[PDB]
């Protein structure tokens, strides 16, 4: 009943930016200071994975 549109999920961009900038510094403790790390989307396989 009514209009239709896809389900979605919102995340505040500032909070996510801060969370990533805080996690990268803890990762640098294991994989080197003054280095670059990346993360793209999933590789492929199961829909639940």
């Amino acid at each position, epitope marked *: *009943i*009514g*209009d239709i*549109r896809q389900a*979605h999920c919102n995340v505040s961009k500032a909070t996510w930016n801060e969370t990533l900038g805080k996690v990268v510094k803890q990762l640098r403790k294991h994989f080197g200071n003054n280095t670059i790390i990346r993360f793209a989307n999933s590789s492929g396989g199961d829909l639940e994975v």
Partner: antibody
Amino acid sequence: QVQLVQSGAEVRKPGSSVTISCKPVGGTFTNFAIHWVRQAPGQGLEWVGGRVPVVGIYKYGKKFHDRLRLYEDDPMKTVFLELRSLTSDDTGVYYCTRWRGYDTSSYYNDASDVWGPGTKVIVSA
Amino acid sequence: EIVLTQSPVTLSLSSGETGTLSCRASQNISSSWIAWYQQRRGQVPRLLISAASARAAGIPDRFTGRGSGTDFTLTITRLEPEDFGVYSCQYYGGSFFTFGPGTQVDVKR
């Protein structure tokens, strides 16, 4: 680009009621409000009422209390105006009006660039 | 209530002549709730200018809109025989919409 399609002309006896349909084509339904602007033969434009389809934010004209009723039908995606206690004054041409422009809010305070072809209501016994 | 009035009831203009229609509001209204419509020969009204200044889609350069607070003006620098008829101003701000009484333009003779 949106569009509005109305019904055909009708002749009703004085004192009875009349029902006019208005269906949009190619656009959002529950967002912007549907207004009704009538024109008596030879006079200026007159605002009948306004109503958001499904939300229910509606309001009629001061002249059209106890005689006007605006409703809708979403299975058909069509709004409906009902006018009771018809006199020779209510004879004229009625226009279904609407504005076009993740937004789930509802607008009622907006102009009308999309106009229906019109419906000719003739009150004559 | 909020009611509108239009001053130059019948405004005569020839080809290339410049005219200015007026639309006075009763109370003080915002400059973002006034629109101008064109109605030629009892046909469908066409939105000329929204928000008293925002020229609509495809509306030519000849139609310029101004106004603030109480008075709103519609200036036509030049005109073809295409744009003749009744011009109406609409207040679309509050919960009650109201139109202008209409203003017809003539070929000046």
